[PDB]
Amino acid sequence: DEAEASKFVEEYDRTSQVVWNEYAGANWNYNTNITTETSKILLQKNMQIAQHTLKYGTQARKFDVNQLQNTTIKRIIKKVQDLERAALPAQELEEYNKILLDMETTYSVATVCHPQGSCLQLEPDLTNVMATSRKYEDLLWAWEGWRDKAGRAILQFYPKYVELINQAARLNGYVDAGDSWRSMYETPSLEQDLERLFQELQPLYLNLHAYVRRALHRHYGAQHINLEGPIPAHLLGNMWAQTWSNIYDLVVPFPSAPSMDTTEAMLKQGWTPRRMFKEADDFFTSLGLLPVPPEFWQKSMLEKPTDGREVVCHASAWDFYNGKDFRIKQCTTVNLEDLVVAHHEMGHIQYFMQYKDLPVALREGANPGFHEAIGDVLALSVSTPKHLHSLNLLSSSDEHDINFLMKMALDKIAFIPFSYLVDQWRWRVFDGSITKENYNQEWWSLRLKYQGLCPPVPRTQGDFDPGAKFHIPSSVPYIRYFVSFIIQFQFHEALCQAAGHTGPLHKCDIYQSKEAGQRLATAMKLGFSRPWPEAMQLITGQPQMSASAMLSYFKPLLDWLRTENELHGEKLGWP
Numbered sequence: 001d002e003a004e005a006s007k008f009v010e011e012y013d014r015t016s017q018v019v020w021n022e023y024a025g026a027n028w029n030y031n032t033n034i035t036t037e038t039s040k041i042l043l044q045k046n047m048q049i050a051q052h053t054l055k056y057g058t059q060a061r062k063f064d065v066n067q068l069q070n071t072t073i074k075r076i077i078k079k080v081q082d083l084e085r086a087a088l089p090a091q092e093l094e095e096y097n098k099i100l101l102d103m104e105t106t107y108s109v110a111t112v113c114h115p116q117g118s119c120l121q122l123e124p125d126l127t128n129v130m131a132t133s134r135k136y137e138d139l140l141w142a143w144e145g146w147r148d149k150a151g152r153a154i155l156q157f158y159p160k161y162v163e164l165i166n167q168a169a170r171l172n173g174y175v176d177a178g179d180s181w182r183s184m185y186e187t188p189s190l191e192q193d194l195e196r197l198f199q200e201l202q203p204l205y206l207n208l209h210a211y212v213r214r215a216l217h218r219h220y221g222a223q224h225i226n227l228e229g230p231i232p233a234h235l236l237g238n239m240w241a242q243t244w245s246n247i248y249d250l251v252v253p254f255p256s257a258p259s260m261d262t263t264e265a266m267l268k269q270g271w272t273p274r275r276m277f278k279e280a281d282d283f284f285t286s287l288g289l290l291p292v293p294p295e296f297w298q299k300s301m302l303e304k305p306t307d308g309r310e311v312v313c314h315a316s317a318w319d320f321y322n323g324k325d326f327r328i329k330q331c332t333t334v335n336l337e338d339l340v341v342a343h344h345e346m347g348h349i350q351y352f353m354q355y356k357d358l359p360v361a362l363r364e365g366a367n368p369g370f371h372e373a374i375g376d377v378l379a380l381s382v383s384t385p386k387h388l389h390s391l392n393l394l395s396s397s398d399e400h401d402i403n404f405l406m407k408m409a410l411d412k413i414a415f416i417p418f419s420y421l422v423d424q425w426r427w428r429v430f431d432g433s434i435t436k437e438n439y440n441q442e443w444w445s446l447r448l449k450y451q452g453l454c455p456p457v458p459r460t461q462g463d464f465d466p467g468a469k470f471h472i473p474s475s476v477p478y479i480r481y482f483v484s485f486i487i488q489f490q491f492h493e494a495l496c497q498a499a500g501h502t503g504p505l506h507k508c509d510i511y512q513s514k515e516a517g518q519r520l521a522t523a524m525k526l527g528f529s530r531p532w533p534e535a536m537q538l539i540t541g542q543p544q545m546s547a548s549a550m551l552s553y554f555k556p557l558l559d560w561l562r563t564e565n566e567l568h569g570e571k572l573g574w575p
């Protein structure tokens with residue numbers, strides 16, 4: 001029993017390394033060069049890797065997994081028994097792979113055009129209109145146009161995608177795809193734990209929402225903003241109103257205290273995508289963490305190709321399963337926003353490098369939330385006025401302090417209900433409580449319930465707004481982002497403590513702290529080898545997810561918001 005198990009794990013690992021490396025390549029090739037040929041080669045590799053998965057997965061299921069002594073081995077075999085899509089019969093298997101490829105392709109190439117005019121792509125054109133335009137109708141054209149073109153086009157594929165991914169999940173022992181995804185956390189109390197954390201951030205969100213709603217009322221007109229209703233989704237400076245920092249200019253707490261045009265600063269000082277990633281690399285090494293290999297700089301795609309190729313622009317980090325080849329694919333724009341994203345992605349790479357000596361089956365984050373959290377933690381320190389000033393992007397009071405906290409809130413707080421919402425919708429789609437006849441209506445029901453937003457244009461049949469969001473056609477679970485935002489503040493707090501910081505948490509900058517880098521390294525090295533509370537414990541000195549660190553970070557702002565909203569008589573929420 002035990003000898004056969006150990007040998008099977010050694011065999012699974014070495015063969016997986018070769019097969020996964022070959023697949024990642026074909027996948028990378030298509031993502032950075034969308035053509036018919038790279039599509040064909042990828043769909044073929046899908047079949048390959050599935051053969052390997054079926055071979056070892058069928059083998060793994062022959063082991064009674066609670067009859068093994070060694071924990072690590074027993075952990076691996078349990079994972080290999082999950083074939084994921086490879087559990088689907090051949091016919092359905094190919095259909096599903098093609099649907100995924102088609103969805104991903106439709107999304108990444110969609111454009112919005114003006115008749116007899118210029119066509120706009122999502123990055124960087126439509127995101128720029130959403131971030132900079134302050135004209136209601138122009139924002140609506142981009143918001144509606146993007147959903148008209150990308151969202152509607154995904155609808156034809158989604159019902160079949162749902163049926164197939166659910167079938168694969170049940171063939172692996174789950175009730176539906178949502179049950180399968182949630183299992184990545186190995187936390188029975190997950191749904192209730194997350195609902196509690198969401199409820200804790202309500203005072204802070206509702207107050208931010210009310211304050212921003214008043215500022216939008218001032219700028220766009222009493223005729224377009226109901227001070228007691230939901231905010232129109234196209235006015236937050238982001239295509240999905242998931243982060244609101246691009247409308248900072250409309251909501252500055254203390255306009256007397258101007259802030260430097262960071263983007264103009266970055267452009268003026270000649271910052272390039274390569275420089276942005278080099279600065280991220282420097283922050284990681286300052287902590288005593290690992291530098292990205294020379295190979296990374298040679299093979300990554302850090303900016304949109306201008307050679308004629310079409311590519312998947314959405315930022316992503318890649319592990320090629322050989323402990324040497326790690327790359328990032330991003331159509332990088334030179335601005336603060338993308339600087340944070342670059343750190344986010346370098347966090348993924350650091351995790352890859354840290355657990356590279358682990359059996360490939362355990363080469364994952366403690367839980368998907370951890371993987372998403374690493375780069376953001378460093379980006380929190382990078383974002384401080386003190387640190388930006390050191391990069392010569394800012395020129396530098398309590399007013400500048402509340403201004404900074406507002407800038408951070410517009411991103412971090414606003415994102416909490418959106419990140420919660422996405423998979424609330426998907427889990428219900430997966431379990432069958434939301435049918436294809438109610439996809440869109442239930443999406444907006446949740447957009448209203450959690451974010452307090454409404455569509456600027458009433459939705460119609462044929463619309464499928466979820467499809468207009470990357471993670472939906474790409475089938476990338478979203479709840480990891482909600483977890484990430486809660487825990488990254490817990491990591492920030494613990495790391496700051498470790499670093500010897502005293503005073504308000506929001507003033508902490510962990511740059512060059514070897515004590516911080518040590519906790520992150522020890523936790524990251526565990527990969528998926530232990531249940532995540534152990535990694536949580538290693539970083540924070542405790543095992544639970546908690547909203548207290550985020551609440552403490554933003555306490556001064558909550559106090560300011562309550563005073564500001566109450567003097568203006570705001571009715572919190574959207575009755």
Ligand SMILES: *[C@@H]1O[C@H](CO[C@@H]2O[C@@H](C)[C@@H](O)[C@@H](O)[C@@H]2O)[C@@H](O[C@@H]2O[C@H](CO)[C@@H](O)[C@H](O)[C@H]2NC(C)=O)[C@H](O)[C@H]1NC(C)=O
Pocket residue numbers: 005006007009010070071072073358359529
């Ligand atoms: C349980 O087994 C793990 C893994 O052992 C390795 O993988 C086996 C399948 C087989 O190939 C063994 O020869 C390998 O050693 C053990 O964890 C390893 O422990 C060593 C020494 O402590 C350490 O160098 C490795 O990094 C560990 N690897 C992992 C994946 O954690 C573990 O010691 C065994 N536990 C018991 C109860 O003996």
Ligand SMILES: NCCCC[C@H](N[C@@H](CCc1ccccc1)C(=O)O)C(=O)N[C@@H](Cc1c[nH]c2ccccc12)C(=O)O
Pocket residue numbers: 314315316317340341344345372376474476481
């Ligand atoms: N310019 C846009 C940058 C996109 C970066 C990122 N990309 C995903 C890719 C997953 C993938 C997995 C597998 C295959 C393909 C892709 C990720 O890294 O996980 C992403 O989605 N982030 C989320 C929210 C977010 C959490 N932190 C951030 C810090 C900064 C900005 C946003 C965020 C979102 O934007 O909704």
Ligand SMILES: [Cl-]
Pocket residue numbers: 240465466468
């Ligand atoms: Cl939407």
Ligand SMILES: [Cl-]
Pocket residue numbers: 181184368369477478479480
């Ligand atoms: Cl997840």
Ligand SMILES: [Zn+2]
Pocket residue numbers: 344345348371372
């Ligand atoms: Zn990520």
